Amino acid sequence: INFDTSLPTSHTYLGADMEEFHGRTLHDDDSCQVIPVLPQVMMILIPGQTLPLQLFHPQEVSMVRNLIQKDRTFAVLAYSAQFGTTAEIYAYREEQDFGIEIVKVKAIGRQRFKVLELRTQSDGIQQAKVQILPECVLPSTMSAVQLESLNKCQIFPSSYKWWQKYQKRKFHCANLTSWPRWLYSLYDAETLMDRIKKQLREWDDDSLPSNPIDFSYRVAACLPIDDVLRIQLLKIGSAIQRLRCELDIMNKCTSLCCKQCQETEITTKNEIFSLSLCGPMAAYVNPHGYVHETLTVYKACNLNLIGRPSTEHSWFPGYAWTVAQCKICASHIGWKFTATKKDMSPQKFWGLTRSALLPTIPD
Amino acid sequence: SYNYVVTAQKPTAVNGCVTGHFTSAEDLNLLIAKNTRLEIYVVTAEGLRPVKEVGMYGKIAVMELFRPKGESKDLLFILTAKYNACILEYKQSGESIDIITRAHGNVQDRIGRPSETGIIGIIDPECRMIGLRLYDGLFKVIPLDRDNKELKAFNIRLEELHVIDVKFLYGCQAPTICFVYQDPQGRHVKTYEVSLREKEFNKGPWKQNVEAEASMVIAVPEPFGGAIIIGQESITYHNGDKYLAIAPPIIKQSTIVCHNRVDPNGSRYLLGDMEGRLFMLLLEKTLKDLRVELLGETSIAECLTYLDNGVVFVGSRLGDSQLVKLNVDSNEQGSYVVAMETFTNLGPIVDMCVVDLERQGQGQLVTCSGAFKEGSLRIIRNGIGIHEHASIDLPGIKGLWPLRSDPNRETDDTLVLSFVGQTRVLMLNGEEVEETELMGFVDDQQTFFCGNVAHQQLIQITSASVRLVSQEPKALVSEWKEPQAKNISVASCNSSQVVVAVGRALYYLQIHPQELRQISHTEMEHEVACLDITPLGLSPLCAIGLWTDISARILKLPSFELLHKEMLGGEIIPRSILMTTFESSHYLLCALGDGALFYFGLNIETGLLSDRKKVTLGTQPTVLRTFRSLSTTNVFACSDRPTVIYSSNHKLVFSNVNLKEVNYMCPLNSDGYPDSLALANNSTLTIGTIDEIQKLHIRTVPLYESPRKICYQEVSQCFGVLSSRIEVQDTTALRPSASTQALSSSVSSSKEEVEVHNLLIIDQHTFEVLHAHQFLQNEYALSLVSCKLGKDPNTYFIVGTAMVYPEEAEPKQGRIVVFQYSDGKLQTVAEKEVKGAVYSMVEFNGKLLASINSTVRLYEWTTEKELRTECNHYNNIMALYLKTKGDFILVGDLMRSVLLLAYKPMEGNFEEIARDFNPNWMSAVEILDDDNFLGAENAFNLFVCQKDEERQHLQEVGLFHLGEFVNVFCHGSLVMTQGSVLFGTVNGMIGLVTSLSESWYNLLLDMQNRLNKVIKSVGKIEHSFWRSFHTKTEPATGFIDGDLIESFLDISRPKMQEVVANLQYDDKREATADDLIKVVEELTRIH
Ligand SMILES: O=C1CC[C@H](N2Cc3c(OCc4ccc(CN5CCOCC5)cc4)cccc3C2=O)C(=O)N1
Ligand SMILES: [Zn+2]
């Protein structure tokens, strides 16, 4: 591999001269907010997830332009709605080329919410009154039970033998409770994050968020799962339960299929790999403003390639895209990507669109 | 749901121990912290004199003594876990002791991340201020200006976000703090100075990359000054330009965790290992070097305190506390440690079970207690105890009588014992008992009564006759025989008045000098069974019980004419009858051969027996007997289940006596055994003192390894106990343990430190380890049950297990092993390999329910004697907890997610009924009933989910801050409100939960509030704050603090009257003090 893994996350295909905004707006826990709603966008946005957009209808063009002046956040509803996630605009681009109006933004999801009201304005744009959900944080399993003479030894110096000494040191006071160190380790953020980091290391070498919340929302976005589980993960407020649930998904779910036919194996977990710094999957907008969450894999099967390779609007610069569909039912599964220069590696790969996929556990 | 929580047994684990001059300046005190309790002793030569013990509405987290400028004696600073700060003073006002609160306030910050090294609290040696490291990036300071009664205080930002330990130093121009910290470079020590004047840190005297794993800090006193810093491998002194360092071989073994200063000088320190090593560290001199001696082995010390005279208090959390004696590096032997005294520490209670051990209808709790050598079973029994001073093997005793052989000594010197057709006399001189003759008393006849009588005489009443003997120059001075030489069948005598009875007839004699004169005669409608004639000089009546009409009766002074005549019912006869006086009233008691005891109020003038009540006390026949217990009379009911009978506010009480059967007893007041009892049974005479009130009594069984689960198999007359010893790799033991010291022994035939699991089999009566079965290499025993399955009559110990490898995070494999204990050994009756860890198991309607990772699985027991699956239930949680009631099943994970599954016999599988997911750490759960579920959850809380279409959500009906960490709940009760659930705890506190009717809940809730107005609270901490469910912080609900309620009885008579002022009460009307007294005393008798 020698492709610039940060080229994808900057979304150059939108144009690379966008006015940037120092991303920071965080509403108080359990507060209420009136935030506009992007029409025409159906996705379950995860905190931390970068969301690119292209907007045409002059009501959309207006209220974005307005948002640039005033707070920059908007609501991205998760549909049948009750729950959603805020998205802050961090880059703006006006464009009146070829005669016609376009606005291009790059938002980033920030905070989860509960919907309260949804008065849709006479301009045509919904305005959602919104309850900001708090992000449940619990202390260590040992914090309550801990011996006070053994408080002094809780911080350590920063290698599988290291994790045993960590487990022995951290959970020594498990002997006061009715369970072992190895059980308490299974609910330990740090142990759980490291275990997830090993499936992440084989997709591939980096630095990721220290925080259990942030980490958990980051890995949530890597998972090619259906819209209904995505919501199960989102509703889970505790980061520890989120990390365990993510470990489960990652171990159990191993094939991926055409959501429509229900029985045509497109690819496997073995093939998943990362060309984005974000991870193996990420949201990209197409020319018409349809967002696609596209999981990059090395090999795919039972896809037919129609049309001819094109570099036009390609989300991965250097690569050209060819449309791929399900051999059986014709469903647009994604795109085969192919190198334009003969020295690039990898030479080819498939980018498969999340909505068209369906993760399965075998037998 | 309406629950009542009460303490059965206060926490026993020590978590702080300080010395100083608290009670007087001239007294040396030892103060001890046991979570919410504060014990205060005075050190003596003889040992530790207890003085004042108090509770707090708080978990003691800091405890330091200090003496601010111009105070006669030391004041105590305490800070709780909820950030309740107080300054306390000891106040003796006359003959009463009180802990008054000089200052108090809550030192919490709204925004704050609590530090990873916990609360740290420190006072400078001038007593200008108190430092509190509560949160990262902050240092709270409370100045000790005497006007600061509200403990108003400022913060100072620290740069260093990861502080390990911290002290205040000695010998400085200004108050100066020294501390180890950690940044991404390494671990260093720094100092600042502290200006109250500026509310800011100035940079201070010195600094230093110290050892990777440095943890402790010690302020050296003023002869030198400076700071000692302990780690894993090193011990480092530090000062301005002076610096020493050592790394002796002797401590690189286990980490040092507690220290204490031996002399004000600072010459010597005591160091505390994590495994029991106790070291001295000597500062050799000026400051040349540091020597470190290894003194000996103690209980695993949480804290240490040198007391003077070479005595040391060892506070422990994992085993018993201790006083130990040190010796100087003596000419003949190296400095060594000796255990002087032991104090019980039940916790950690890791598991327990309730057993009716004595067969008496009286539960006994047996706990898995302690860790790592301090491991133990503890047998906790409720009752009145007997302090035994002498024992004598003499079988077949039928009666006891004390007697004064010398008429001008004020004290018993004789015990008389009757046997079948035979009388014996034991004389007493101090503690020397010798059988002897008593001239005038016959010895070839069975005595029915003897003792002192009026006009300087002794009387003996045999089956043959009524002999009467002179105190002086003993000889027979009188004898009374039955007209046709028939045997006296029943006897009863007092000061001046005999009433024998022959068959159906009964005569009535009186005692006058050198003559016993016959006064009455009479007949009786059936054969006579028992008599009493107790004065309440001479008694004007006589009680009887008879053989066929099965009836208790009163009679006249000489006539013998019926005065009340109550029928008692059934086919069994009376065995004893007793006219007695409790409180200031009069009663008649009467006992049946089947164990039943009936009592009646008595009228001495008329004879009217009133208000019959019944109670059943141990199915063998029951002899009743009067004794004195602190300027008042009780009754001792000798039976299967011996029992004392007192009267608390004009309603009688039946405190059971903590002994295997007593057949006869008498009081004994000798010079060597003053204010004592003589108890006899079938084989033994015992002499002892007796405790006034009931208490909990603790038998200890050391295992010298960690016990982990326990259950009782009644048929085998023994206990299953999962245990766990530590070996080190060769793999060899560190000490002999229960599992390596068993009679019989075994190891499972197959499919640096290491843990080795066993199933012990321990005798019910003797607690000998009979057998120790060792599980596989890498096998971790998790669950244990003792049950019968299917059509099989045999009873099995069943164990769930998991296979733990350090490579493997979630265990992929485990076993369900069925065992039979039949010979002295243990037979593996069946394995069952399973693709996961068996966290729990439970006997389920004659089948075996068992959690395996996320799966709940039901197994049936075949006639082929194998486990066969019926059904399964995959969950989205890990089934750590499993409890059932009938066909209902309760599942829980560690994160307070709970499910409610039901078995459906018609459908073959399990169905979900209800669920609740609410992220918090859960340590134990229990089924209160079909609808209600008790649980224990993070920051020492209890909580109750209730059951009651889209009503498969569980309503949260209960919340309460207990202040203890519950490991185990278990249904049972230690006495002979609805329901009883006992729980064991990490500090060895034991609690009981019961349920109330709404009416009672509402009353008692009102009364809590009335109580909280009236009762002084130590740190001036509000009871509501204390019991608030805390992590969120919400008021407690659906839980009555029974400890609070019970405290009503300890308040003064007017404070009661205040508490009940205009309180509506049912029967409503304006209630009295005595109305609530008898309610609260009804509530004490559930535990
Ligand atoms: O890596 C990838 C994988 C393929 C993916 N693409 C290309 C694409 C198209 O490609 C034709 C095309 C490309 C560009 C335009 C230009 N605009 C500007 C705005 O006004 C309308 C005209 C129009 C049509 C046409 C339709 C859909 C897609 C689509 O999903 C993608 O975007 N980047
Ligand atoms: Zn298809």
PDB file of C-alpha atoms and ligand atoms in Angstrom, chain A residues 257-264 266 325-331 333, ligand 2:
ATOM      1  CA  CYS A 257     -24.425  -9.875   0.925  1.00  0.00           C
ATOM      2  CA  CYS A 258     -26.730  -8.099  -1.499  1.00  0.00           C
ATOM      3  CA  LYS A 259     -29.504  -6.629   0.671  1.00  0.00           C
ATOM      4  CA  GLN A 260     -32.064  -7.111  -2.121  1.00  0.00           C
ATOM      5  CA  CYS A 261     -31.592 -10.753  -3.233  1.00  0.00           C
ATOM      6  CA  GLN A 262     -30.685 -11.894   0.257  1.00  0.00           C
ATOM      7  CA  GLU A 263     -28.433 -14.771  -1.016  1.00  0.00           C
ATOM      8  CA  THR A 264     -25.411 -13.647  -3.043  1.00  0.00           C
ATOM      9  CA  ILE A 266     -20.452 -10.054  -2.255  1.00  0.00           C
ATOM     10  CA  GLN A 325     -24.096  -4.489  -9.685  1.00  0.00           C
ATOM     11  CA  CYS A 326     -25.436  -7.784  -8.188  1.00  0.00           C
ATOM     12  CA  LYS A 327     -25.056 -10.475 -10.831  1.00  0.00           C
ATOM     13  CA  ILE A 328     -28.500 -11.833  -9.767  1.00  0.00           C
ATOM     14  CA  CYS A 329     -30.841  -8.875  -9.140  1.00  0.00           C
ATOM     15  CA  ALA A 330     -29.045  -5.945 -10.808  1.00  0.00           C
ATOM     16  CA  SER A 331     -28.794  -3.912  -7.571  1.00  0.00           C
ATOM     17  CA  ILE A 333     -23.823  -2.659  -4.921  1.00  0.00           C
TER      18      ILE A 333
HETATM   19 ZN    ZN C   2     -28.605  -9.299  -5.470  1.00  0.00          ZN
END
